[PDB]
Amino acid sequence: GTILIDLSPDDKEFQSVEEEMQSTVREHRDGGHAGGIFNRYNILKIQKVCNKKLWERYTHRRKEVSEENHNHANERMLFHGSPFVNAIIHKGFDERHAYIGGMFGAGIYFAENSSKSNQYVYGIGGGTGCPVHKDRSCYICHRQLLFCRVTLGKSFLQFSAMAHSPPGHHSVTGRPSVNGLALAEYVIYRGEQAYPEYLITYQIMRPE
Numbered sequence: 674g675t676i677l678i679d680l681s682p683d684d685k686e687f688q689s690v691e692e693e694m695q696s697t698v699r700e701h702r703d704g705g706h707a708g709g710i711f712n713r714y715n716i717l718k719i720q721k722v723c724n725k726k727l728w729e730r731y732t733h734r735r736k737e738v739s740e741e742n743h744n745h746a747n748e749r750m751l752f753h754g755s756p757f758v759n760a761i762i763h764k765g766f767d768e769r770h771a772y773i774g775g776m777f778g779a780g781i782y783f784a785e786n787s788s789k790s791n792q793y794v795y796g797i798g799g800g801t802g803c804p805v806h807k808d809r810s811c812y813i814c815h816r817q818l819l820f821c822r823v824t825l826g827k828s829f830l831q832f833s834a835m836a837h838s839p840p841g842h843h844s845v846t847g848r849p850s851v852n853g854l855a856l857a858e859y860v861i862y863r864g865e866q867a868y869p870e871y872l873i874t875y876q877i878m879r880p881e
């Protein structure tokens with residue numbers, strides 16, 4: 674029951690999503706090994722992901738979390754990069770899309786930095802890169818990210834360089850503690866706490 678609606682580049686909604694995508698690129702400590710070498714993207718398409726059942730699944734859980742957290746869902750828009758992007762948009766997030774070996778345990782991981790999520794597009798550590806060229810830094814092949822609505826609720830703060838949420842919390846926040854340019858990363862332990870709202874198709878761009 675998923676349909677994808679293309680946004681026009683003229684639509685303010687397209688523009689605000691592209692701006693989040695572009696302005697949250699950073700340099701990574703792997704020098705580009707996993708995600709490639711780039712300072713910006715070429716955005717090819719932004720589509721709105723519409724699925725009534727998945728949406729109501731999200732909002733049902735959002736209200737539960739909200740009622741357990743003084744009427745505060747603590748909702749963010751965050752990036753998600755995954756080899757499973759096609760299954761996520763049709764079926765929603767579940768345990769099969771968790772990063773089992775993640776530093777905050779087996780959950781589903783999201784990033785404020787688009788360039789962080791870009792590192793998982795072709796798998797953990799960038800896998801073997803793009804299917805066609807086996808190039809983790811491919812400038813030709815089309816990549817896809819999700820920009821997602823994520824319910825954090827009471828988030829456990831972890832200072833740092835499917836399982837369950839820590840008791841009394843609805844999520845974990847990875848607060849970066851040495852790379853002063855890194856933004857936060859987040860983990861949820863229930864698929865129903867994220868809705869894959871925008872599908873963004875793009876290429877990374879070779880720097881000049």
Ligand SMILES: O=c1[nH]c(-c2ccccc2)nc2ccccc12
Binds near residue numbers: 754756773797
């Ligand atoms: O966007 C992120 N995706 C993933 C990921 C890991 C395994 C399978 C599928 C997706 N992990 C992340 C870890 C930190 C920040 C963002 C992401």
Ligand SMILES: [Zn+2]
Binds near residue numbers: 814
């Ligand atoms: Zn390629």
